[PDB]
Design an enzyme around this catalytic site. Structure first.
Site, mmCIF file in Angstrom:
data_model
loop_
_atom_site.group_PDB
_atom_site.id
_atom_site.type_symbol
_atom_site.label_atom_id
_atom_site.label_comp_id
_atom_site.label_asym_id
_atom_site.label_seq_id
_atom_site.Cartn_x
_atom_site.Cartn_y
_atom_site.Cartn_z
ATOM 1 N N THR A 13 0.818 -1.204 0.000
ATOM 2 C CA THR A 13 0.000 0.000 0.000
ATOM 3 C C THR A 13 0.856 1.259 0.000
ATOM 4 O OG1 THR A 13 -1.726 1.225 1.189
ATOM 5 C CG2 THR A 13 -0.245 -0.170 2.513
ATOM 6 N N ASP A 45 -0.091 1.285 -5.479
ATOM 7 C CA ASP A 45 -0.194 -0.104 -5.887
ATOM 8 C C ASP A 45 -1.617 -0.588 -5.669
ATOM 9 O OD1 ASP A 45 0.100 0.383 -3.264
ATOM 10 O OD2 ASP A 45 1.292 -1.386 -2.826
ATOM 11 N N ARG A 54 -3.284 -3.392 -4.462
ATOM 12 C CA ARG A 54 -3.309 -4.669 -3.749
ATOM 13 C C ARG A 54 -3.664 -4.423 -2.286
ATOM 14 N NH1 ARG A 54 0.357 -7.114 -0.972
ATOM 15 N NH2 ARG A 54 0.518 -9.359 -0.647
ATOM 16 N N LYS A 79 -6.219 2.562 -5.555
ATOM 17 C CA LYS A 79 -6.188 3.400 -4.368
ATOM 18 C C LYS A 79 -6.341 4.873 -4.696
ATOM 19 C CE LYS A 79 -3.737 0.327 -1.330
ATOM 20 N NZ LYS A 79 -2.671 -0.288 -2.163
ATOM 21 N N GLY A 105 -3.781 3.499 5.099
ATOM 22 C CA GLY A 105 -4.371 3.188 6.383
ATOM 23 C C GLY A 105 -5.546 2.262 6.176
ATOM 24 N N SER A 132 2.288 1.373 4.189
ATOM 25 C CA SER A 132 3.070 0.430 4.980
ATOM 26 C C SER A 132 4.526 0.444 4.548
ATOM 27 C CB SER A 132 2.498 -0.974 4.842
ATOM 28 O OG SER A 132 3.042 -1.609 3.701
ATOM 29 N N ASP A 183 8.858 -4.861 -0.022
ATOM 30 C CA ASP A 183 7.819 -4.808 0.987
ATOM 31 C C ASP A 183 6.843 -5.949 0.784
ATOM 32 O OD1 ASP A 183 4.931 -3.595 1.894
ATOM 33 O OD2 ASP A 183 6.570 -2.912 3.178
ATOM 34 N N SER A 204 2.405 -4.985 -0.253
ATOM 35 C CA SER A 204 2.372 -4.292 -1.525
ATOM 36 C C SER A 204 2.370 -5.352 -2.608
ATOM 37 C CB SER A 204 3.572 -3.366 -1.679
ATOM 38 O OG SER A 204 3.566 -2.767 -2.955
#
Lengths: 219, 246, 224, 193, 195, 203, 240, 233, 224
Positions: A1, A17, A19, A33, A47, A129, A166, A169
């Site tokens: 994210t 991203d 996901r 997003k 968040g 994140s 990460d 993501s």
């Protein structure tokens, strides 16, 4: 994210991203997003994805209503000055890390709002994140007054760095340019390397052990 | 006879609100005029400084009230109703900052004032506010804006308008004064609008009021660009502009 | 407190209808590929800038409104019209339907008749716009009722102004052809023969967003 | 996130770093710890940056709604700060108020966690890094000074408060206040060595 | 706790309950208590839980249905009665606890004999058997062994004699007395039996 | 909570969608009190919602959603499309933000002469997870995502889709313990609907 | 004066004028058949510029099995329909079943009765023929007034020219009436009430329930009533 | 045709009746007076109600009120309705003192009192106030200023003003002598000479002066300075 | 509030023949350290009565402003010299403010000491709000009251709040005499606060001594 945001010489380029997740599994491989606040201003938040729905749609219509009251296009410092009035009263209730910004009468701004209510101007930021991984490659290749193509590959590398480095993501990467003329909702680098292709098994059609067939033909 | 004008929320057989109609006559009966005119990148308000019909300090009596540091306005009519209208505007324009961050626009301020005015019309709560005014002020678009509002709901907006008891003897004069600058010479804009618009504004007031227009009985304000403050022009500059008629 | 009468009719409503019978003429005509609206803008002088005083406002990206009465009331009903176009847009992500919108504004106008100590609205609305079920052109009455019109006028002297539409209107007219039959219903109807960019005209513009035609754009049609 | 307010012989100065760290990470680098209120007073807050932006908003709304109540060119100075105290009837945040006045020459006084009784102050300083320079300020600060003396004093003060602090800022900001309201946001970038 | 055994046949509905009135963890205030809430329209509500909350909710739902049965001359439908009390339980949950357990049973010509189960929370559902309390863990299984279709009304009384007797032997608190509310052919008798 | 488990899985074929849900309503976590508690509802003739979670909200949200739809449904002669309906559930759940509505709904149905699949997921707070492919929510969402990953073709037949969703539920229900017996699958075509109740493991 | 005050005769004033205000409104016909209840209407034509093909404001929909034919103030009619739709849905939300019409008119006449008793507001100049089907007592047809004194019926003709159109149903109506025979029966009383011999078909609207175990409740199009209008020509169920 | 009944009814002429009658109500009550001086602001208040009571105490009926130590307020009209405005005046000072920790300035108090009087005029049920209020003060640096608040707002700054039953009489007596630069100790003897012109030798005129360089705070009448009244010249 | 973040030291109130003697230092500690060292705690509330602090200094403004306001309201109705609010009134009013806060949970941590002259036999019928010989009082016209944060209230001849209750009061309970001279009182506090300089962790110099006599409210500032 990981959601990256930066400002070019005349426009602001956002990117994230597609996901979402639940902690141990993947929600879906495609969930844009990015958002649509208006024609000259876009949004993207991190968040909890649930609270972001009634914070984007609520801001989209409240800005649209204010856009129809006057005649000029809305300004980026008005919307951010409205979320804090609601986010403070929901200091432990509403939690969101929103990044937004677009062209207006002033220069292309880019505000970063915190869940507790903090918000300030930022020329380049990364929220999510794996935001640390996104801001890592960003601070090493961020020149001032870059072209749109110079910012397109930067935000593409900023998200791709937050994709491999990460866990929270993945999936494709979509970006957007918020120039004064129009917008763009492009989805480049949709990872087509294809390390291994699946093999779906279409099951045969014998029966599935069904005791009742209450078929209906309603029009 | 006992006609249909007792209450404020009762229509007439022909369909006219007579409580509103009588409220406009209250402004025309105060015999206080004011001229407002917007030119290129500027706009001015000309007061009259007269008691709403000895030892009165003339520096205190005025018809100009700044709502904010960017949006100024004038007021006419009854002195009691005009004072409360400024407070219902200062508490509204400042409320826009606390509720929306940006400074309030000049066109949004007049429409928000008329919204509260229209509420007192349909309901028999209170008496109408016998007042009028010219809201002046530049916006974010770096353009001057002028707006006039009657006792009823109105957000007309004019490039040059007269408020007061002589609105029926000034449109024939303001049109000529505006024509004396639009279809005339119109060379350039050397940021000398004060010597171009205010001079062609005080001249409009002298054509309305047949007096000699004493400098100690008139005060103007400018909201032009490079200033942006609704500054009341000092006495020495007012008397200096009065001699430019020759 | 606008009570009844022994004849069985509201007297304050009948008085309110006289106010819309003596204002500027508003005119809307539907077509097969859009809806058009027009209003005779009575310019009193050249001081009033045309971009401030208007008679055609928007409710959303597909809903157009027209006023026909008390100019001071041209904003309060608009604020609650846009608010209802937002309350429906918050819950339901799609666009607000005209029949769903006009039934709410008709309910708002209605509540200003039965409530004690209030005054009915002194205006007549003309809501028009593109819908997923075709086009629509409704008219709101100060009494609270609404009609699903096709081509109507609500301003001053509409008993004879509608007569032009009862004889110069077909069921299948294009939006470009309906403009000249609307201008004829304004210029050739009564005084205001000097129609030179003094008429506001809004159109649905064949399923595109609501477009307020500019003065020079109408000038192309004002030559006939 | 240190904040230092030193008084002049005629005006006053303010200083602040720009870090606003969020859990051993800098999320809003080069922010504005100091804030503007009017042409004669500034407010530099620190501490919890959560409710900090709301108090600055309410103060800005109550200042504009109060300055227009008198006339066009007259605010007041002590009146605005005691109103900030009444807004603590919690939101833990230390604030510094300083500026020129129409009655007295200059004025600078802090607002602690809940009580603004620090009037007639001279070297008001607060924040997290304020604990490291409370003694250094008490020694190099004389009674009356000049403009360049206080500018060179607070430069090392914010530098020393940043040389040994995890919440050390990046580019520091220094705001002046005088009778003519010079208010030049002198930004310095050099760090200690 | 207390057991609330219910069983729905094809032309009859029986209800079983404990006639004990447990006060605290030690003494029994009275034997042969009142847990049923008979309704005029051939409906027999049966609650289970703490005696205090078991009483007020039994009366808040009895008068609220008798009121509805008088505001219209008709009688409340059993399908509507079950979903009505479920709404009141869900309504009395975000404010007050109301630790009760109920079994709704009735009869109507539009759908035959019905039976509805519930929970502390609102878990309404039409069933054919089922119980409540701690005793449900020893009686919800015996009902599956003797639930052939087209059961006569006299067969269920022998099932409960094969069920109550099991509660007397393998339950922590051996309930001896029992109350039955048979609803055979528009008649609601009460064949309360011990052992 | 992990109380009164259940699962709902929605599939999207070529021009026909399908839903499935268990039927074992559990009193406690490890208990079974009823095997005839369907978790799919006919909100419209082109909108089928599938609820999952605690039964105190499955019935309550269905009564609220029916009251809000049926009231909106009569204000227009035409029916309610899924586009305006899916956005409603995100509003009801958010209006009940700090409310205990413990449900994970699933909204399937044709988007509309034409017909589109339109599947949508939600959370306890109301995040509209749009998905033009398969969808799932419930307490057994973990054993259904991977299950409906290696067994999902893009476009399928009307009868072929039913076999895919059959093995997708019978393999996951036999792997979980709380989401017990019963599987009232529901395949639906623009002109015909099919309500089949599979014979799952009664354990 | 106001509605709160009485009169020396014992009657009222505001509720009496409203009873006369609906007499100057278009007529509506009610009719219970052996297959389902049917309704009639009269679209008042202000001009020929209305849509006349998609809408009609004399018969509305309350629920999927309850529908009314309004007659009176068209403006005040929309409030009660917006008020009856909530009661027809709040009963479903509270009892999980359809609402009987006998429990709906009581829920709606009380909202009228509450206005002619306090508040100092004008009453509702509206009265309508509300009918539907229920499992308790089959098809029904009730009729409300601006005072609230509802009453069941078999056939009612409120609006304008009530006494003449109601007399038609005193003789031509039968206890056993099929759906097609009932429509022709209600078609003549709808036409002769306006002193005409044949409806122009760009007029009157009809509705019918006829529960086929699902309560179809179909309305009528301008082409569907043409076949009904043609059947009136051959078999004339005359004025009498 | 009888349009002056309620306060919300506007006359067809354009005037606002039912509020102009209040001026005829304050024209029959006792008078008050004040004026600017180069040393302070001396006030005055004549209570011409001697012919009916003659039993009240000598220094009891006082009509001089102060919100704090440096702002005086007098009445002219209904003494009962003026109590409510003083309650709104002191509360306005106390509310301003809580929120700003300083004395309330004059140009912000007068604008808040005039709003309170004007607010009761707009209502259709509350009757308007019937008391004209004189508000004055005397700064240390700047000179004094007297604000006059009559019914229906209209806050006006003055330099000397009289309101009561002889407002068209005493106004001509103030313009004779330039009181702007004389004193306070001599004007007090001149004020007592005016009252004798327009009606007996009685001590029913109680008044105080805000400044005589007596810490620039509101003092009392100071009887010893009032007793040597020049009763003949 | 919650927690004494900005505490204060302790004051000492002792009465004698000429008047009331009070003393307090200027240290306003921020818990573990001396943040402010030049604050005032002895607050003037009238021309004849004063009041001191201890506890949280921040929860004193919510009590100082709520007390100085009452003095101006009483001063505006001074129709006689006997209408001044006696110290008995202020002490009983402050106790009521603490008792209503005690009913809730927030107590506004303070241990206010109210001292003053409870008489009107010394002419002061003229107040100088914004800025010769002494007299002898009968020891009953001198009111010195104490108020705890729990609402405990009383009055005595010598009060000492805060942390000096365990230090000052001990040395002062046996060394106090009746009708002490002015030099006797200041030498008693000077030798008393010295003990509070080597034992109290939160105390300092700058003893702002304030005396309330029959002629005014004076101020002095020694340094020991």
């Amino acid at each position: 994210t990981t959601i990256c945001g930066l400002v070019c010489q005349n426009a602001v380029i956002l990117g994230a991203d597609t996901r979402a997740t639940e902690g141990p599994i993947v929600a879906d491989k495609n969930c844009s997003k990015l958002h649509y606040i208006s024609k000259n201003i876009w949004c993207a938040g991190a968040g909890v994805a649930g609270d972001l729905e009634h914070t984007t749609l609520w801001l989209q219509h409240n800005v649209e209503l204010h856009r129809l009251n006057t005649n000029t296009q809305p300004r980026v410092s008005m919307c951010v000055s409205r979320l804090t009035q609601e986010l403070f009263k929901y200091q432990g209730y509403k939690v969101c890390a929103i990044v937004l910004g677009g062209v207006d009468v002033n220069g292309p701004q880019l505000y970063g709002i915190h869940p507790h209510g903090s918000s300030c101007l930022l020329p380049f930021t990364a929220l999510g994140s794996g935001s640390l991984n996104a801001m890592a490659v960003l601070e090493a290749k961020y020149r001032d007054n870059m072209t749109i193509e110079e910012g397109k590959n930067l935000v593409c590398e900023a998200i791709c760095a937050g994709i491999f480095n990460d866990l929270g993501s993945g999936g494709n990467v979509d970006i957007c340019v918020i120039t004064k003329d129009s917008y763009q909702h492009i989805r480049p680098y949709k990872e087509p390397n294809m390390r291994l292709y699946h093999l779906p098994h279409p099951t045969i059609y014998p029966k599935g052990t069904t005791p009742i067939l209450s078929e209906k033909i309603e029009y | 006879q006992s006609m249909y004008d007792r209450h404020l929320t009762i229509f007439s057989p022909d369909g006219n609100l007579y409580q509103i109609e009588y409220a406009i006559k209250a402004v025309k009966n105060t015999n206080i005029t004011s001229v407002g005119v917007k030119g290129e990148n500027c706009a001015v308000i000309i007061s009259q400084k007269k008691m709403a019909t000895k030892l009165l300090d003339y520096n205190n009596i005025t018809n100009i009230y700044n709502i904010t540091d960017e949006i100024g306005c004038s007021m006419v009519g009854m002195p009691g109703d005009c004072l409360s209208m400024v407070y219902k505007a200062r508490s509204e324009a400042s409320e826009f900052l606390y509720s929306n961050g940006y400074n309030v626009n000049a066109e949004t301020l007049c429409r928000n004032i008329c919204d509260k005015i229209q509420v007192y019309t349909q309901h028999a709560y209170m008496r109408l506010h016998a007042c009028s005014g010219m809201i002046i002020g530049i916006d974010e678009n770096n353009k001057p804006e002028l707006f006039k509002f009657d006792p009823s709901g109105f957000c007309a907006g004019y490039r040059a308008c007269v408020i007061g008891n002589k609105e029926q003897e000034s449109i024939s004069v303001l049109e000529r004064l505006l024509e004396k600058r639009k279809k005339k010479i119109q060379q350039e804009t050397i940021d000398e609008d004060i010597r171009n618009t205010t001079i062609l504004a005080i001249e409009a007031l002298q054509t309305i009021l047949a007096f000699d227009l004493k400098a100690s009985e008139i005060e103007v304000a400018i909201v032009s660009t490079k200033n942006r403050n609704f500054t009341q022009i000092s006495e020495k500059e007012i008397d200096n502009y009065l001699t430019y008629i020759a | 407190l606008t009570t009844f009468s022994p004849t069985g009719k509201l007297v304050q409503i009948e008085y309110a209808l006289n106010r819309v019978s003596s204002s500027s003429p508003a005119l809307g005509i539907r077509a097969k590929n859009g809806v058009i609206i027009a209003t005779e803008k009575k310019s009193p002088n050249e001081l009033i800038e045309e971009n401030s005083i208007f008679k055609i406002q928007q409710i959303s990206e597909h809903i157009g409104i027209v006023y026909a009465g008390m100019p001071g009331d041209f904003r309060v009903l608009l604020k609650r019209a846009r608010k209802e176009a937002i309350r429906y847009s918050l819950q339901y992500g799609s666009e607000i339907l005209v029949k769903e919108l006009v039934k709410i504004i008709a309910s708002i106008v209605q509540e200003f008749t039965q409530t004690g100590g209030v005054r009915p609205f002194g205006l007549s609305l003309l809501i028009c716009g593109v819908d997923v079920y075709g086009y629509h052109l409704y008219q709101i009455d100060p009494s609270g009722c609404y009609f699903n019109w096709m081509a109507t006028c609500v301003g001053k002297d509409y008993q004879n102004n509608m007569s032009f539409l009862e004889k110069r209107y077909n069921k299948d007219i294009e939006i470009e052809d309906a403009i000249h039959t609307a201008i004829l219903t304004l210029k050739e109807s009564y005084e205001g023969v000097l129609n030179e960019k003094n008429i506001e005209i809004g159109v649905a513009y064949d399923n595109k967003p609501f477009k307020i035609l500019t003065q020079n754009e109408i000038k192309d049609y004002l030559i006939e | 996130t240190t904040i230092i307010g030193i008084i002049y012989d005629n005006g006053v100065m303010l200083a602040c770093d720009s870090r606003t760290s969020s859990g051993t990470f800098i999320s809003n680098k080069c922010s504005r710890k100091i804030n503007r209120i009017n042409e004669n007073l500034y407010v530099c807050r620190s501490g919890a940056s959560a409710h900090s932006q709301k108090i600055i908003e309410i103060i800005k709304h109550y200042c504009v709604s109060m300055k227009n109540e008198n006339r066009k060119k007259g605010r007041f100075h002590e009146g605005e700060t005691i109103y900030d105290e009444t807004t603590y009837d919690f939101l833990s945040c230390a604030l510094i108020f300083g500026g020129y006045d129409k009655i007295k020459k200059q004025q600078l006084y802090a607002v602690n966690l809940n009580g603004s009784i620090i009037e007639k102050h001279d070297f008001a300083v607060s924040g997290s890094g304020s604990i490291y320079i409370q003694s250094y300020l008490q020694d190099k600060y004389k009674k009356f000074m000049t403009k360049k003396e206080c500018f060179n004093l607070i430069l090392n003060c914010v530098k020393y408060a940043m040389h040994n602090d995890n919440s050390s800022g990046g580019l520091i900001r220094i705001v002046n206040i005088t009778k003519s309201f010079v208010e030049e946001f002198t930004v310095v970038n050099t760090q200690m060595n | 706790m207390d057991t609330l055994i219910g069983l729905r046949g094809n032309n009859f509905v029986v209800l079983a309950a404990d006639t004990y009135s447990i006060n605290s963890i030690i003494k029994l205030k009275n034997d042969d208590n009142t847990k049923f809430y008979d309704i005029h329209g051939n409906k027999c509500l049966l609650l289970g839980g703490s005696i205090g909350d078991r009483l007020q909710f039994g009366e808040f739902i009895r008068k609220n249905v008798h009121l509805y049965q008088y505001q219209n001359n008709t009688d409340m439908f059993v399908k509507s009665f079950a979903f009505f009390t479920r709404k009141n339980l869900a309504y009395y949950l975000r404010r007050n606890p109301f630790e009760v357990n109920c079994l709704i049973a009735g009869y109507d010509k539009k759908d035959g004999y019905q039976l509805y189960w519930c929970d502390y929370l609102s878990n309404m559902d039409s069933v054919n058997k089922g119980a409540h309390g701690y005793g449900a863990y020893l009686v919800s299984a015996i009902l599956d062994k003797y639930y052939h279709e087209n059961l006569t009304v006299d067969e269920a009384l022998d099932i409960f004699k094969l069920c109550f007797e099991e509660l007397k032997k393998r339950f922590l608190l051996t309930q001896i007395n029992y109350e039955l509310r048979i609803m055979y052919d528009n008649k609601v008798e009460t064949q309360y039996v011990t052992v | 909570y992990n109380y009164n488990g259940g699962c709902v899985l929605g599939m999207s074929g070529s021009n026909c969608v399908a839903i499935a849900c268990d039927l074992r309503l559990g009193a406690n976590t490890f208990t079974t009190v009823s095997t005839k508690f369907s978790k799919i509802f006919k909100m419209n003739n082109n909108v089928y919602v599938g609820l999952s979670g605690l039964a105190t909200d499955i019935q309550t949200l269905y009564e609220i959603l029916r009251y809000r739809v049926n009231l909106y449904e009569v204000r227009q002669d035409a029916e309610m499309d899924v586009e305006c309906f899916a956005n409603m559930l995100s509003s009801i759940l958010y209006s009940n933000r700090f409310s205990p509505y413990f449900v994970n709904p699933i909204v399937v149905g044709f988007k509309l002469v034409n017909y589109e699949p339109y599947l949508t997921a939600y959370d306890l707070i109301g995040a509209k997870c749009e998905t033009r492919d398969f969808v799932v929510n419930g307490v057994t969402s973990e054993q259904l995502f991977g299950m409906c990953e290696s067994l999902y073709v893009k476009d399928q037949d009307e009868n072929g889709l039913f076999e895919t969703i059959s093995q997708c539920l019978l393999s996951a229900l036999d792997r979980d313990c709380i989401s017990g017996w019963g599987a009232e699958v529901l395949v639906l075509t623009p002109e015909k609907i099919i309500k089949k109740k599979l014979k799952a493991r009664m354990d | 004066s106001r509605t709160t005050t009485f009169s020396p005769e014992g009657r009222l004033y505001q509720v009496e004028y409203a009873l006369e205000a609906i007499n100057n409104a278009s007529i509506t016909i009610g009719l219970i058949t052996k297959d389902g209840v049917i309704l009639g209407a009269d679209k008042v034509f202000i001009s020929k510029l209305i849509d006349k093909a998609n809408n009609y404001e004399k018969i509305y929909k309350i629920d999927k099995h309850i529908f009314c034919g309004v007659a009176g103030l068209n403006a005040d009619a929309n409030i009660l329909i917006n008020q009856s739709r909530l009661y027809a849905q709040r009963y479903l939300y509270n009892y999980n079943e359809v609402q009987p019409v006998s429990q709906l008119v009581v829920q709606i006449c009380d909202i009228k009765q509450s206005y002619t008793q306090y508040g100092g507001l004008r009453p509702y100049g509206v009265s309508f023929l509300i009918g539907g089907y229920d499992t308790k007592d089959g098809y029904q047809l009730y009729h409300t007034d601006p005072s609230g004194n509802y009453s069941g019926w078999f056939a009612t003709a409120i609006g304008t020219n009530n006494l003449t159109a109601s007399s038609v149903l005193k003789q031509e109506w039968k206890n056993d009436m099929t759906l097609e025979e009932g429509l022709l029966l209600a078609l003549k009383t709808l036409a002769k009430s306006t002193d005409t011999e044949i409806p122009k078909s760009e007029k009157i609207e009809l509705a019918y329930l006829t529960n086929k175990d699902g309560e179809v409740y179909q309305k009528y199009l301008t082409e569907k009533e043409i076949e009904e209008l043609i059947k009136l020509y051959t078999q004339k169920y005359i004025k009498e | 045709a009888g349009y002056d009944l309620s306060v919300s009814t506007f006359s067809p002429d354009g005037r606002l009746y039912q509020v102009e009658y209040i001026y005829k109500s304050i024209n029959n009550n006792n008078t008050a007076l004040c004026l600017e001086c180069k040393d302070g602001i001396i006030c005055c208040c004549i209570n011409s109600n001697m012919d009916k009571n003659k039993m009240i105490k000598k220094n009891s009926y006082n009509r001089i009120y102060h919100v704090n130590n440096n702002i005086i307020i007098t009445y002219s009209g209904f003494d009962g309705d003026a109590r409510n405005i003083i309650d709104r005046a002191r509360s306005e000072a106390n509310t301003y003192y809580y929120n700003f920790h300083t004395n309330i300035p004059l140009h912000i108090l007068v604008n808040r009192i005039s709003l309170y009087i004007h607010a009761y005029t707009l209502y259709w049920h509350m009757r308007p106030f019937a008391a004209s209020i004189i508000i004055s003060s005397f700064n240390e640096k700047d000179k004094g200023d007297i604000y006059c608040i009559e019914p229906n707002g209209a806050c006006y700054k003055y330099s000397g003003i009289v309101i009561g039953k002889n407002k068209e009489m005493f106004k001509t007596e103030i313009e004779k002598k330039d009181y702007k630069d004389i004193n306070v100790r001599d004007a007090i003897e001149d004020i007592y000479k005016f009252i004798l012109t327009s009606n007996n030798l009685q001590n029913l005129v109680n008044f105080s002066w805000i400044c005589k360089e007596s810490s620039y705070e509101f003092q009392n009448i100071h009887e010893e300075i009032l007793t040597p009244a020049l009763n003949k010249a | 509030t919650l927690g004494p973040v900005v505490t204060g030291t302790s004051v000492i109130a002792i009465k004698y023949k000429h008047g009331i003697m009070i003393a307090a230092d200027r240290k306003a500690s921020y818990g573990s350290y001396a943040k402010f060292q030049n604050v005032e705690r002895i607050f003037k509330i009238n021309n004849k009565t004063v009041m001191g602090f201890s506890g949280e200094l921040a929860d004193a403004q919510y009590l100082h402003e709520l007390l100085t306001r009452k003095n101006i309201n009483n001063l505006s109705e001074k129709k006689r010299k006997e209408d001044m609010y006696t110290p008995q009134h202020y002490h009983s009013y402050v106790s009521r403010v603490f008792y209503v806060r005690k009913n809730r949970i927030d107590p506004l941590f303070n241990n206010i000491i109210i001292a003053g002259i409870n008489s009107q036999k010394y002419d002061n019928n003229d107040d100088n709000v914004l800025l010769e010989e002494y007299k002898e009082i009968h020891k009953d016209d001198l009111y010195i009251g104490f108020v705890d944060m729990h609402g405990t209230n009383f009055c005595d001849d010598y009060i000492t709040t805060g942390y000096a209750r365990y230090f000052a009061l001990t040395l002062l309970r046996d060394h106090y005499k009746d009708n002490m001279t002015e030099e006797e009182a200041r030498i008693l506090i000077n030798e008393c606060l010295r003990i509070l300089y080597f034992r109290d962790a939160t105390s300092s110099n700058f003893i702002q001594i304030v005396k309330v006599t029959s002629k005014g409210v004076e101020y002095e500032e020694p340094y020991i």
